[PDB]
Amino acid sequence: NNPLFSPYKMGKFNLSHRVVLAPMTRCRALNNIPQAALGEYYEQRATAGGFLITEGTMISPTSAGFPHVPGIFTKEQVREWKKIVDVVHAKGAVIFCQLWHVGRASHEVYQPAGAAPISSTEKPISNRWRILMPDGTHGIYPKPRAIGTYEISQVVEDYRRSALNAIEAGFDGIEIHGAHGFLIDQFLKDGINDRTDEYGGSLANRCKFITQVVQAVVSAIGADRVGVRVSPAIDHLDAMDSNPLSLGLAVVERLNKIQLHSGSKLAYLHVTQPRYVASEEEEARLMRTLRNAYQGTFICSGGYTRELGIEAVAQGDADLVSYGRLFISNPDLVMRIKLNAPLNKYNRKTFYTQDPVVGYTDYPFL
Ligand SMILES: Cc1cc2nc3c(=O)[nH]c(=O)nc-3n(C[C@H](O)[C@H](O)[C@H](O)COP(=O)(O)O)c2cc1C
Ligand SMILES: CCOC(=O)/C(=N\O)C(=O)CC
């Protein structure tokens, strides 16, 4: 009896197992347009009753910090996503689109007119980190432009419109990327957010942006079609908080309150294990504390294996387990976990390259 293969009711969606495709930027969506290669890639990994989360997807022309990542802010993008969603649904899978704004984790080369990226702050990511450039070299993260509250409201509207576009494309739902030092995390983390207005200072103020984003998408598409990803403790892009557990619990409280207000539960809360990068006990403590505090479905992610995923579900630490790197190199990861079959190695060199086949769809099945 493998606990990963017991069914699970994720709100309206009846899942047949607990193995989730974690959202992974792969950079094959040339010119920000979903391509046929994405259809092949997601189709390979789809299973009947399995849940897939897409690569981060742009909500606006200013939201990108990687090359050739898809958007869902134009009608052309919606039309191409629909073809991908249809082939995934034909396999019986459930698929959510992750909505992603990078904030300050960008570069002039990724911005319209070469403008500065936006953030909560004018503080740049430090020179300890370098950004992948379209030519494969690495560049300098620039100083971002700190946005005012009118512009904050327009970014919230970008999330809302992108959620509606995702539904128009046929997605079952969306995930808010609120993790990993990206735009939402630049408001959450007190190591980044140095604002003195209503969006900074107190923990309550720092949580305002994520609350408004989640509220907007819930109001647009329904809470049961909205997942939220956060990472209160993460070593990525200078995104630290002085009190990660209290930050996490404050976010959880806002989500619990949104659910009570809306009269419905979110699809899930998705949290990255602090071990994941691009004390072992304090890390598991943080995860279980957030799970125990949240009134709903919990997806854990970051460094999971077959054994660690089985343990997480068996022990009640998570309802669903998302896998990233092993899903890159094992299109049939679900079946391999079921059979306890050996897994293929992954090649980091082709994680972010543009080839529609090599290192993308050419990892073999059993
Ligand atoms: C190539 C790659 C791209 C990723 N892109 C995203 C992304 O777009 N959005 C996101 O929330 N996480 C992203 N992550 C993190 C994954 O969703 C996931 O949490 C992580 O890979 C899980 O750890 P694992 O690889 O040990 O399974 C990415 C990870 C990898 C390896
Ligand atoms: C290390 C935490 O950050 C991530 O996992 C991530 N996006 O969220 C990427 O790596 C983008 C390619």
Numbering used by the authors: 9 to 286, 297 to 384
Quote the study that presented this structure, word for word:
The biocatalytic reduction of the oxime moiety to the corresponding amine group has only recently been found to be a promiscuous activity of ene-reductases transforming α-oximo β-keto esters. By studying the crystal structures of enzyme oxime complexes, analyzing molecular dynamics simulations, and investigating biocatalytic cascades and possible intermediates, we obtained evidence that the reaction proceeds via an imine intermediate and not via the hydroxylamine intermediate. To gain more insight into the reaction pathway, we determined the crystal structures of the two enzymes OPR3 and XenA in complex with the oxime substrates 1a–c, either by co-crystallization or by soaking. All the crystal structures obtained had a high resolution (1.9–1.35 Å) and showed clear electron density features for the oximes.
To assess if the introduced amino acid exchanges affected the overall structure and the binding of the oxime, we also crystallized the tyrosine variants in complex with selected oxime substrates. The protomers in the crystal structures of the tyrosine variants are perfectly superimposable with the ones of the wild-type enzymes, confirming that the exchanges did not lead to major structural alterations. Interestingly, the binding mode of the oxime substrates also did not change in most of the structures. Interestingly, the exchange of the canonical tyrosine (Y190F) did not have an observable effect in this experiment, indicating that fast protonation in the active site is feasible, likely via a water molecule. On the other hand, the canonical tyrosine variant OPR3_Y190F showed a 2-fold increase in kred and an 8-fold decrease for the NADPH Kd. Though a parallel 2-fold increase in kox is also observed, the Kd for the oxime seems not to be affected by the mutation, indicating that the canonical tyrosine residue does not play a role in substrate binding in this enzyme. As an additional aspect of the crystallographic study, the structure of XenA with 1b might explain why only XenA efficiently transformed substrate 1b, and OPR3 did not.
